[PDB]
Amino acid sequence: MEIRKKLVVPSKYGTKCPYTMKPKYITVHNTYNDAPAENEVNYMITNNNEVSFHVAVDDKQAIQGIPWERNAWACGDGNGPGNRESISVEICYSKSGGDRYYKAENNAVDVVRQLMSMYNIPIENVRTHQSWSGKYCPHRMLAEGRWGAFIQKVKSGNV
């Protein structure tokens, strides 16, 4: 699926993505919200908080808000490898779940595979936010035991 562009303005880089980055990992998150990717991204690139992520994926589309080679503030590890070396993928509708959420997760498999090919990132480098800082994220995937199956789809699925 095509990843739509809806990037934050350069004048806000200092707040949303101040550093350049050489992607080495991909971090998967759950939004813990029930908003479409367009809403997640629009809010993220417009507010003034030092909080961001690279792409949001819902049941219908994938939207990029931060250049892949600039950092995002989403892993909670300060200037650690999560925030400074990983591209963050946000999966929408995880708050209430439902068909919309599982559709978004499966679309995220496709998004993650595109990023792996793009930056030559190995399957061992696809990580959970939890692995970087301890936060229970992706919450629904961890709660339902879906991470293992997700990794296998990313590793060799044809989507």
* Closest approach of a copy of itself to the CB of residue 97, in Å: 12
- Beta pairing partners, 123: none
Q: Using CB under 8 A, pick the residue from 133, 146, 153, 155 that binds a copy of itself.
A: 133
Stretch that binds a copy of itself, among 41-49, 65-73, 127-135, 146-154 (CB under 8 A): 127-135
The pair of three-digit structure tokens given for residue 60, joined into one six-digit string: 């219908």
Q: Which residues are annotated as a binding site?
A: 29, 129, 137
Q: Using CB under 5 A, pick the residue from 29, 54, 70, 140 that binds Zn ion.
A: 29
Conformation bin of residue 57: beta by default, left when phi > 0, alpha when psi is -120 to 50: beta
The pair of three-digit structure tokens given for residue 49, joined into one six-digit string: 């908080």
Among a copy of itself, Zn ion, none, residue 82 binds (CB under 5-8 Å by kind) = a copy of itself
- Beta pairing partners, 3: 62
Which residues inside 76-115 make contact with a copy of itself, applying CB under 8 A? 76-82, 84
9/85 with CB nearer Zn ion: 85
Among Zn ion, a copy of itself, none, residue 84 binds (CB under 5-8 Å by kind) = a copy of itself
Binding mask 110-129 for Zn ion (x = CB under 5 A): -------------------x
Which spans of this chain sit near a copy of itself (rule: CB under 8 A)?
A: 32, 76-82, 84, 130-137, 139, 143
